[PDB]
Structures are given as C-alpha cells and as structure tokens.
Amino acid sequence: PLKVEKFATANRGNGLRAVTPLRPGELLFRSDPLAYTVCKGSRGVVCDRCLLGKEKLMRCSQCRVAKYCSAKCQKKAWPDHKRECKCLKSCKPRYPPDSVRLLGRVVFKLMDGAPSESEKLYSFYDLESNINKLTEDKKEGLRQLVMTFQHFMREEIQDASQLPPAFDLFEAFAKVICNSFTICNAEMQEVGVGLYPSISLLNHSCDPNCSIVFNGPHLLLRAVRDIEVGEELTICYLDMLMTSEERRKQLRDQYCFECDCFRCQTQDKDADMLTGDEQVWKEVQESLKKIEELKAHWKWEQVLAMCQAIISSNSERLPDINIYQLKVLDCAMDACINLGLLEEALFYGTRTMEPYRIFFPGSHPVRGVQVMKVGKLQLHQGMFPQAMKNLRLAFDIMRVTHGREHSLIEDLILLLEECDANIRAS
C-alpha cells in the first residue's frame, strides 16, 4: 500500500504528496531505473552494470567499450547492452554524450509490453519536457543531440518508423534533460545517470522534506522530516554548496522555473557561504572548474596537487567555511582517501565538519557519509573517543537518510562495534 500519490499542484504541474503522515527516515518508494548508464568520467573505472569500482575490469569482447567487474555482471547486463554494443563499437575512440547513450537504452525499453515497475506512478511519456519554455540556445543544443543520436544509433535504428509513434526524439531529449538523476556511489562520487520516471514526479525545494540515496543503480526515497497528510513531497535537485543566485540560475537554465522557496527569497546562508574577500575566493572558484573535471575522471594525484597549492596559499586569508575553499578541502580529502594518504585525508576532512553541519542541516546523506568518512579515519589512526562520537553522529543521520535497506548501514554498525572494542581495551 503506497504512502505517496500523484496529484495536480496549483502552479508547479504534477507532484507527489503524502497519503498518510510520515516520520523521519520512513521509506516512501524504491525503484530501479527505467534505463541508466555509467557516466563519462567513470567509464572504465566502475562496472557498467553494478557501478562499483574495481582495479581490474573486463571488457566486452565485442565492442571493447563496456567494462564489467565479473562474468555475472556481464551476463546480467547483456539485454540492456545488446542493442548498443554495435553502436559503441562503430565510434570508438569517439564516444556519445551520456544523454545520447542513456536515450539509446530508453527507446528499446519503451517497446517492452510488460509494465515497468519504475513507471508505476508516472511514465516516460508523462515526463515534463518544458518544450514551450525552452530558450533558443537550448533548442539548438537539443537539435544537436538529436543529430548525434541519429548518427550514433544508425546501425540499429535508421528511421522514426522503427520507434513507437508517440515517441518524438527532440521532445525525448528535452525530457531527459530535466528528468534525469545523477547516480552516486556509496562514497558520494558521481558514477552514472538514469531515468526514474515515478521519482521524477517530485518537485524541487532548496529545503526539501525528502531525500534520495543510491545503492548501485537502485534508488531509495525517504522522508527526512515529519510530513503531514496531504503535504507535497519535495527533493533538492541541486548541490547544497551553492548560493541563492547560483541555485536560481541553474534551476532557471535547466528546469525552466524561478525558485521562490524560503531560502532563495531570504538569501539564507549566502553570507556564510561567501565568507572572505571576493578577490581571494573568486580565484578558488575558477580553479575548481578544472579540479572538479579531474575528480570526475578519478585522477586523484592531479586533484590533490591542485588542491594542496590552493589550500597552502590561502591559509592566512580565506576561511574554511567559504563554499569554494570547502569544496577544495573535500576534493583534497577524497583524493587522499583514494590514494591511501590517510593522515592527510583526516587533516582535510576534520576541517569540513563544522561547515558541513551548517550547510547540510537536519538529515542529509552527504553529511552522513562525510561524518562516517571522518570517523573511519579517526578510528584507524587510533583516536577512539573522537571516532566514536563521529560514527555515532553518522548513524543518527544515516538511519534517516539511508535506512536498513542501504548496505552502508551494516558497514557503519561494524565500525561502531570495532571502535567500542578499542575503547574498552583502553
């Protein structure tokens, strides 16, 4: 029996609302994707099927593009990979934009006669395209994606008569652009992109009452606050470390609306986010463009070298709460974890804790995972009382944001039990 239902909002189109009162941490919905793909920077780093990193991946021998952790993943991925294999092979080393590869998988799913559980509440054809609100530059970009799709798919599909007549390729890309979800791994690195049409019913708030987390491709939707009967359910489409002007620009450009939520109207936290001299932090913001691109491709040594230069040079001027300096510290922490420099990772990660408490209020999965990473570093460096406090804090957050249906909870319980054992051994 569903705890959520589709309804027509006044001014926001369709939405999702609570059928019964909801408590923090309650699981509302769970979904596999209608279709998904590994993202550009992660291809060849993580398994095409399960989106897990492995030092050794094995290539599809037919295209040499898709890569898998195991013969089991390769075989289970074959129905989804079978019709794109020849297409990926044709263009190697050239590779299609993620949206093109995703839509190539979507179109063949739409020809299944069985109902897709991912479409239970809302279908692909229901998805909002905003076609009448798109700017001319956006429509030109969509026309370019259409031509790229037609070229990429030409071995499999040469004409619109080979796809359902209700499908329109231009409108499909418009739907993909405002309805796709970024898939993150357990460590909150972006590994993939997918369509989850029932979950696309949720409208946006910069102070949402629900949160989504991924376990591989699988999506869990949870309440993060108490929610009354009939209350609209919302999620945040955006990164939390963004000022209100940045948020409004991204929501206008991608999603075609002007965000009037309480935080955007009141500039909530902007002053803290921008702490320090703009002449100083604008340089960090600019450097972050390259850093975030390197991080997306998992180039950790390069990330760390760029971050260290910024962190040492600004130490006398720029506070850690500034969101651009904070992102650099987080990139530095994750680079160090991935490179095995654990003492240095803890130095950067400890510095993110109070800014994360301020900018991720309540229960947010990004803060839960960050606090867990810091507690895990403290535990292995032998600071047990500090680690225990952070691991307990992480569990308080993650029981709400992750829940027992997410496998990271069992990992956290093991760390808590190990920390407790070291404390007792004195």
Partner: peptide, 10 residues
C-alpha cells in the same frame, strides 16, 4: 559528440 541530472556529489 554536457552536465545534466538531478542531485550530485553534494
């Protein structure tokens, strides 16, 4: 033959 999609690393 860029960046779209709800949510992300933060």
């Amino acid at each position: 033959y860029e960046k779209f999609g709800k949510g992300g690393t933060y």
